[PDB]
Amino acid sequence: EARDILKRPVITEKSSEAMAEDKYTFDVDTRVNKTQVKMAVEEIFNVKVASVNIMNYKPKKKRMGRYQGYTNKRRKAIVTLKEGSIDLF
Amino acid sequence: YRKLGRTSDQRKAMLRDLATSLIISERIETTEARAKEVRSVVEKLITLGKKGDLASRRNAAKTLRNVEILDETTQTALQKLFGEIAERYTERQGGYTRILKQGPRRGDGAESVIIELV
Amino acid sequence: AVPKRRTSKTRKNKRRTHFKISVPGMTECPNCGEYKLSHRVC
Amino acid sequence: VKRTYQPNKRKHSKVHGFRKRMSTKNGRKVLARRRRKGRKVLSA
RNA sequence: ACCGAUAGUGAACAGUACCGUGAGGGAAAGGUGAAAAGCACCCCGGAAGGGGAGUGAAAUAGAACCUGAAACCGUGUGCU
RNA sequence: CUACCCUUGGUCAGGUUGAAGUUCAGGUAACACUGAAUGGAGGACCGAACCGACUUACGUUGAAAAGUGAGCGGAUGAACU
RNA sequence: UGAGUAGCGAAAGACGGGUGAGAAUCCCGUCCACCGAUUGACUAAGGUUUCCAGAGGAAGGCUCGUCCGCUCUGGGUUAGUCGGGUCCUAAGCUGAGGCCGACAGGCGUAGGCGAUGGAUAACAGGUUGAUAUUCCUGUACCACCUAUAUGGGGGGACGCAGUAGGAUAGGCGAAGCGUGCGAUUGGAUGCACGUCUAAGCAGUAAGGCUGCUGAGCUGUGAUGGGGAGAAUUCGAGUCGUUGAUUUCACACUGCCGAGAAAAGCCUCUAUAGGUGCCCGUACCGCAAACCGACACAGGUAGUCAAGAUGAGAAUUCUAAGGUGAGCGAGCGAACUCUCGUUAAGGAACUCGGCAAAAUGACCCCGUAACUUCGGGAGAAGGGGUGCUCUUAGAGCCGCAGUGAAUAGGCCCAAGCGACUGUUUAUCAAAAACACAGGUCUCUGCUAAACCGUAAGGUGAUGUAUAGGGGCUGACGCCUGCCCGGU
Ligand SMILES: [K+]
Ligand SMILES: [K+]
Ligand SMILES: [K+]
Ligand SMILES: [K+]
Ligand SMILES: [K+]
Ligand SMILES: [Mg+2]
Ligand SMILES: [Mg+2]
Ligand SMILES: [Mg+2]
Ligand SMILES: [Mg+2]
Ligand SMILES: [Mg+2]
Ligand SMILES: [Mg+2]
Ligand SMILES: [Mg+2]
Ligand SMILES: [Mg+2]
Ligand SMILES: [Mg+2]
Ligand SMILES: [Mg+2]
Ligand SMILES: [Mg+2]
Ligand SMILES: [Mg+2]
Ligand SMILES: [Mg+2]
Ligand SMILES: [Mg+2]
Ligand SMILES: [Mg+2]
Ligand SMILES: [Mg+2]
Ligand SMILES: [Mg+2]
Ligand SMILES: [Mg+2]
Ligand SMILES: [Mg+2]
Ligand SMILES: [Mg+2]
Ligand SMILES: [Mg+2]
Ligand SMILES: [Mg+2]
Ligand SMILES: [Mg+2]
Ligand SMILES: [Mg+2]
Ligand SMILES: [Mg+2]
Ligand SMILES: [Mg+2]
Ligand SMILES: [Mg+2]
Ligand SMILES: [Mg+2]
Ligand SMILES: [Mg+2]
Ligand SMILES: [Mg+2]
Ligand SMILES: [Mg+2]
Ligand SMILES: [Mg+2]
Ligand SMILES: [Mg+2]
Ligand SMILES: [Mg+2]
Ligand SMILES: [Mg+2]
Ligand SMILES: [Mg+2]
Ligand SMILES: [Mg+2]
Ligand SMILES: [Mg+2]
Ligand SMILES: [Mg+2]
Ligand SMILES: [Mg+2]
Ligand SMILES: [Mg+2]
Ligand SMILES: [Mg+2]
Ligand SMILES: [Mg+2]
Ligand SMILES: [Mg+2]
Ligand SMILES: [Mg+2]
Ligand SMILES: [Zn+2]
């Protein structure tokens, strides 16, 4: 279940500053809670989690040509480790 | 005298601003009618500077704006007028400015001119 | 207040007889070999 | 001037929403009519 | 011995867009070419757009692309 | 939207007037009665916010399918929200 | 076609510098101007990516555009404590059984849902292009976990007005300290700013109530932070005055119209370690992003509330902060509109003094008929305001002294309506409606009346000093004749 909870890492300027501060940003399944996120990270990466922050992103308006629709809604989790680190390369 | 499309107070403020700008920069670009009024305002200020007494200085301060001018020295517009400009025009009897037409502006067709100290 | 009849092409063009612009007043500039408005500076 | 439409999320959903339509026989008739016409939107 | 894009379904590309608090109302919009061979390259231009050169049977078939009527808008002038 | 209502909230710069009571003083056989102070009532008064819309000017292919400028009515109440 | 015509949607801009193919219109700067009980700041609804960065200029922008709430690409919203849910109930909605009804369905008991109300644990500082009581730093608190050590009662719990106080916030002044600055215009050696720091935790405490409560203060929190400042280190937190619209607190007094519920809560039958979910969080927000077809002079709930002047949140100029309004340049004709002035006269204008003018603040004199004894009344009509000096006088100046702005015109008489109030959203605000008061009439309670087919309801958790209906319309004096007809 844990590898379903964690979808992908998020790579941005703000996420990179977070990684400099030992915070790792993941896109997670939109149904899971932050406790599940913490358990999944601990299990997958064999690290210790200090805290997990979470937020939702609404669908964003997007178009190509005459077709206007929306992107997928997102759930973003920021995981603060107390022990260890995660190698994304 | 011209009205320049402004009320009395607006016109007076704009003429003071233009005269002080001309004193600071020695050459400005504006509209023809504005320059044709600014020439009289600026020449009377220069006359006051050539007089150079305390009363003439205070009368000039009635009209000039309070703009600092920065060899790292610093002086006010009134100081420049009663110093450098007056000394340069000690021997000339009027006609301290000249207007040079340049042609219409793109945005509104206004006749642009350059008015400069001679 | 409103036109009683439509304006014919003939009448419209007759009215527009004087609706035109004029070539500007221009003179040759000696040094640069170009043109400018008379009594204006480059 | 104060106009007639003063939007209100709660009022809109409570008066014109799916559950309000479901709650009455005539509301279900509305939903059936819109499904028959092929509407993309059935309710508020 | 039905229609042929104002016809025929409202809809040849839509119960969409849009309108309405809502029930509900409800469009417009088809066609390059046989084949994309959809204009390498040069020139003016910031671009847009053009002129060449090329492709093509044909480019006033260059995509707002078959045919291209009329209203309407221009340029030239034989008579007045 | 609007009319009325239900439940639950909120708002009203400042001036002015001075009801009932009370107390003290006169006064009585006992009450009535009177003056001063105190007191702070009122769909009270003047007037901002706010709520209106009386007059007038402007606007009348509007800035606006009912508005704007200047005055104007109410403004602790059957108030406004 | 009208026609290069009307319009381009309230207003102050100017110049220098830059960018660029192109600049009145973009960026930077200086000066100027406008708002400032707000054109400032913060919540809510509503909108829903409009937010940020880089790039772009076809179309949108009432001009232009190098710019944008527009286009392209990539980003941005972090919570045990904030608001909501895992708590409570109001109106209302719904409703197991049940009652009623051609059908469909209507009603309703227990119960349930349902904030606009009740309960409930976190503060200060720092930081980004875009989030922050959410991230970070420091210091806390709450619930639960692990280890060492059910009935009763109370309460919650409530209106409106007014008054006297305590405290604090805030304002002002002296400069006590601190930081700067110290002036080429005649003169002086003075000019301008700063003067703080939370929750929590201990001690205490003006008051209030009949021991319980209680604003606030002190210390700690804090060799931390923030600071007018000097070149990463160093830097002041003091005296007086005024004083709330905040809080003690609906505490106290008074009044009639007599002012939720339920749960949480109360009462009677320590330390240590660890855990703490979901939803919202971007941005606009009295608006260019909401409702008005618009980048529309309209509408849109609450909060914060500086100085001078003043009774004031009025007036005028300013502070904090924000803004110069998405067409301009000339000219200075008629005419239109909005403003200012005007000889002599002064309503001769006109349906009508319509409009305008005049009055206007504060202080002191003074004030009629009539009256329901309250009023009328700010009746009317008159005086005084500047500045300096002495302690009410003496002086000084102007045409003028509330020298600006803001601030009742008044009187006499008549109709109607007693009065405050209400009305034809959008041509009528009135003499119309209402009204307190009067009278008539119905109604003995499963009342009459009203809604509904009914059940069920309103009347009313009322009971003839009550409820419904008709007419009249304060108050004073009064309200005559006719019962043949309806
Ligand atoms: K209410
Ligand atoms: K919202
Ligand atoms: K002219
Ligand atoms: K009766
Ligand atoms: K009879
Ligand atoms: Mg969250
Ligand atoms: Mg002129
Ligand atoms: Mg003026
Ligand atoms: Mg055809
Ligand atoms: Mg068809
Ligand atoms: Mg052809
Ligand atoms: Mg063709
Ligand atoms: Mg207020
Ligand atoms: Mg009153
Ligand atoms: Mg009033
Ligand atoms: Mg009305
Ligand atoms: Mg008005
Ligand atoms: Mg009155
Ligand atoms: Mg035309
Ligand atoms: Mg013309
Ligand atoms: Mg014409
Ligand atoms: Mg004209
Ligand atoms: Mg015009
Ligand atoms: Mg404009
Ligand atoms: Mg504002
Ligand atoms: Mg932006
Ligand atoms: Mg344009
Ligand atoms: Mg964009
Ligand atoms: Mg029911
Ligand atoms: Mg922000
Ligand atoms: Mg925000
Ligand atoms: Mg919109
Ligand atoms: Mg607007
Ligand atoms: Mg508005
Ligand atoms: Mg309002
Ligand atoms: Mg004001
Ligand atoms: Mg605009
Ligand atoms: Mg006169
Ligand atoms: Mg006269
Ligand atoms: Mg007279
Ligand atoms: Mg007459
Ligand atoms: Mg006459
Ligand atoms: Mg009048
Ligand atoms: Mg006054
Ligand atoms: Mg009346
Ligand atoms: Mg009235
Ligand atoms: Mg009307
Ligand atoms: Mg009217
Ligand atoms: Mg009557
Ligand atoms: Mg009889
Ligand atoms: Zn030349």
Coordinates of C-alpha atoms (C1' of nucleotides) in Angstrom, one line a residue, chain G residues 20 68 273 341 442:
Chain G
rG20 C1' 12.8 49.7 -27.4
rC68 C1' -1.6 44.2 -18.1
rG273 C1' 8.7 9.4 27.0
rU341 C1' -19.3 88.8 -9.9
rC442 C1' -69.8 37.3 17.3

